[PDB]
Every structure is written in C-alpha cells, then in structure tokens.
Amino acid sequence: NFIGSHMIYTYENGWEAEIYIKNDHTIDYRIHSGMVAGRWVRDQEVNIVKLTEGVYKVSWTEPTGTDVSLNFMPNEKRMHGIIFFPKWVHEHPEITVCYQNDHIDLMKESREKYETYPKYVVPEFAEITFLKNEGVDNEEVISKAPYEGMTDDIRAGR
Amino acid sequence: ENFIGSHMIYTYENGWEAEIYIKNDHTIDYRIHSGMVAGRWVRDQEVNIVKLTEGVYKVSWTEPTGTDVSLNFMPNEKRMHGIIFFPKWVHEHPEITVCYQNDHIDLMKESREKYETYPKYVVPEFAEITFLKNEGVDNEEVISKAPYEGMTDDIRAGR
Ligand SMILES: O=C(O)/C=C/c1ccc(O)cc1
Ligand SMILES: O=C(O)/C=C/c1ccc(O)cc1
C-alpha cells in the first residue's frame, strides 16, 4: 500500500512539504515553508515506480518549467528530492505561490516571459514526520491552501 | 559505498543503450550508444550523488543543454531507472547535442536560448545493467573516446 500515502516531511534546508499519492499516476501537494511556502497543486500527473522493496520514485514536470524527482523510503522515515527550478522561479518564486489549478496558463505565460537559465537546483534529504494511507482518489486529503500551523494540526489530528 | 568508481552499461526499455562512469563523489563521464541521441558523450559532468538505502543510489544533474536528469541505480539487482527531462528542441533537433560536449559547451548554451524549450519531452524508463566494473576513482581513461558501432560489445568482451 504505497499509493494512497499522505506524508509530510522537512528538507535539511528547512523546507516543509506535504504530498499525497492519489493514484498510480497522480499527486496533490502543499508547500508549507521555504522559498515558496503557500504553493499548492492538485492532480499533477506523475511517474511513480518501485525501484526495490521499500524504495519508490515520484518524478514529474510542472507548468512552471520546474522538473522534480522524489525518492521515498518510508520504512526509514526518509526521502530525497531534487528540484530543477528555472531561474525565474528562484528570482520570482511568489508567482508560483497560489492554487496552481486555477492559474495554469499564468505559469505557462510566465515561463516564456522570464529567463530560464541558469537553473537553480535544490537536492536535499528530508525527514518524513507523517505517513497515513488515505486510500485512493481521496479528493479531500489536500483541499485547502496551507496556513501557518497546518502541519501541526495534521500531525495532532486537530 | 564502493559505488564510486563504478563503470556501467545499461539498456533502457525504450531500447536506448547508455554507459556511465561514476568518477567521483560529485562527477561523472558518460556515452550514449543508441537511441534518439546515440553518439553523444560527456566528461566531468558535476553531479549530485547520494545513497538512499543499502543498495540504492541516485545520480542527478542538469546539462548545458537544459536537460535535467535523475538516475537511480540498484546494482545488486542489475537494474536502474532514469528520468530525463528534455527541452523541446532537443527532441526536435537531437543531432545538435551529438557532440563531444566538452569541446562545444557554449554551443549548447547558445542553442537552448535559440530554440524552444516547452513543452518538455520526458523519458522515464527502467534499464538492465549489462556491465559493472569498478575502475577506481578519477580514472580519466575509462571514457576517453567517442562511441562507435559495436563498442558496447567490445567493452563487455574485452577490447
Ligand atoms: O515536494 C517537492 O519535492 C517539491 C515541491 C515544489 C513546490 C513548488 C515548486 O515550485 C517546486 C517544487
Ligand atoms: O542516462 C544517461 O547517462 C544520459 C542521458 C542523456 C539524455 C539526453 C542527453 O542529451 C544526454 C544524455
């Protein structure tokens, strides 16, 4: 049961992110802190694979031009992520902050408008600090913008 | 672990055959032997290398072409997985990238500005590792010539 998993983790650089593996090919996610705290995304098509017993890999590309490849080892409460940010997302991360689904064309208009190279690459580990299977296609799991303290509320059950 | 120094050849399920040499904890060389971009070879590519668990590793990086790569290797299981994020133009005009990159880095940069980037062409595949020899560290000769038809066999055999 890896699909359906709902995790919160904290990258070694202090960023706190939340992902929900909704399908074998779809995720939702929320960013709670860091350069781009506030951003949240739903129905992001993704490549999900099992690499071995215990290890998984969720990778995809964004309407922003950002390319992501996450590896999860939940048994070990650990994961690794590498994010390839187009220059402009580093310069102007605030553009990307919103509920993406409502403004997809904005992200596309933006990645053409602003500069792409050199990319800003963030490769970090993270500690998983929450893991609850919510079953498959559970649309309510990630359904509101993040707010200060939300991660605690989730972890507390509150 | 004793993963640095490794020299592997593998074949992606889409039929592409590639060759990598893990030269350092932060550097690779590589050769592409078939597929859309057969002929391409690269040296001293800075990379992010990590151990994720016992047996599993991850080499990821970005190219002067704009291509972003994240490879996972599980050598014990003679298997690996790769995802490659190609800028549109590399899919349209892969021949540009077919080069000893080091001699023409600025070409790649001039190109990724000149041509279109979006939508990207994403290739996420498994591959079977068909060769694995540790060649120790900073062995500069391991990958030192452009690939030729049959080269992978020659390596696997002995020449
Ligand atoms: O959770 C991750 O691994 C990456 C999250 C992310 C959120 C917004 C971005 O613009 C890029 C990455
Ligand atoms: O898997 C590898 O070792 C290299 C892949 C690759 C894909 C596109 C390129 O333009 C160069 C290398």
Cα–Cα separations (whole angstroms), residue A99 to A24, A43, A63, A142: 22, 12, 13, 11
Please list, in sequence order, all residues whose beta carbon lies within 8 angstroms of the beta carbon of residue A157, skipping any fewer than 6 positions away. none
Would you say A101 and A131 are in contact if contact means Cβ atoms under 8 Å apart? no
In this complex, do B120 and A80 lie within 8 Å of one another by their Cβ atoms?
A: no
How far apart are the CA of B40 and the centre of ligand 1, in A?
Answer: 31
Q: CA-to-CA distance for A127 and A10, rounded, in angstroms?
A: 5
* Burial of B72 per CB tally in 10 Å (0-12, 13-18, 19+): buried
- DSSP assignment of A65-133 equals S-EEEEEEEGGGTEEEEEEEE-HHHHH-GGGG-SBGGGGHHHHHHHHHHS---S-EEEEEEEEEEEEEE
Helix then strand count (H, E) for chain A reads 3, 9
- The CATH superfamily label for domain B1-159 reads Calycin beta-barrel core domain (2.40.128.20)
Question: What amino acid is encoded at B17 in this protein?
Answer: E
Kindly list the distances between the CA atom of residue A21 and the CA atoms of A18, A59, B58, B138, in Å, as whole numbers in the listed order.
10, 12, 21, 40
Greatest distance between any 2 Cα atoms in chain B: 43
Interchain proximity A69–B74, CB inside 8 Å: no
Q: A47 alpha carbon to ligand 1 midpoint, in Å?
A: 15
Task: Spell out the residues 6+ positions from residue A137 whose beta carbon is closer than 8 angstroms to its own.
Answer: A22, A23
Eight-class DSSP state of B90: H
Q: Could you say which residues from 30 to 49 on chain B have a Cβ atom under 8 Å away from some Cβ of chain A? A: 48
Letter for the amino acid at B130? T
Find chain A residues with C-beta within 8 A of B115's C-beta: none
DSSP A141: T
Categorise residue B114: left if φ over 0, alpha if ψ from -120 to 50, beta otherwise: alpha
A16, A9 contact by CB (below 8 A): yes
CATH architecture for residues A1-158? Beta Barrel (2.40)
DSSP-based three-state secondary structure for B88: helix
| Neighbouring residues of A26: CB distance < 8 A, sequence distance ≥ 6 | A43, A44, A45, A46
Q: Quick one: which of A149, A116, A13, A5 has its CA closest to B114?
A: A116
Instruction: Pick the ligand that lies closest to the CA of residue A123.
Output: 1
Mutation target to probe the A interface, by most A beta carbons within 10 A, among B48, B62, B86 is B62
CA proximity to A74, closest of A2, A141, A18: A2
What resolution in angstrom units was achieved for this structure?
Answer: 3.0
Set of chain A residues whose Cβ sits within 8 Å of the Cβ of B52: 55, 71, 73, 78, 80
- Which ligand approaches the C-alpha of residue A88 most closely? 1
Technique of determination: X-ray
The residue assigned the tokens 């993270």 is A126
Domain map of chain A by residue range?
A: 1-158
Q: CB burial class (10 A; 0-12, 13-18, 19+) of residue B159?
A: exposed
Helices and strands in chain B, H and E counts: 3, 9
Are the C-beta atoms of residues B67 and B32 closer than 8 Å to each other? Answer: no
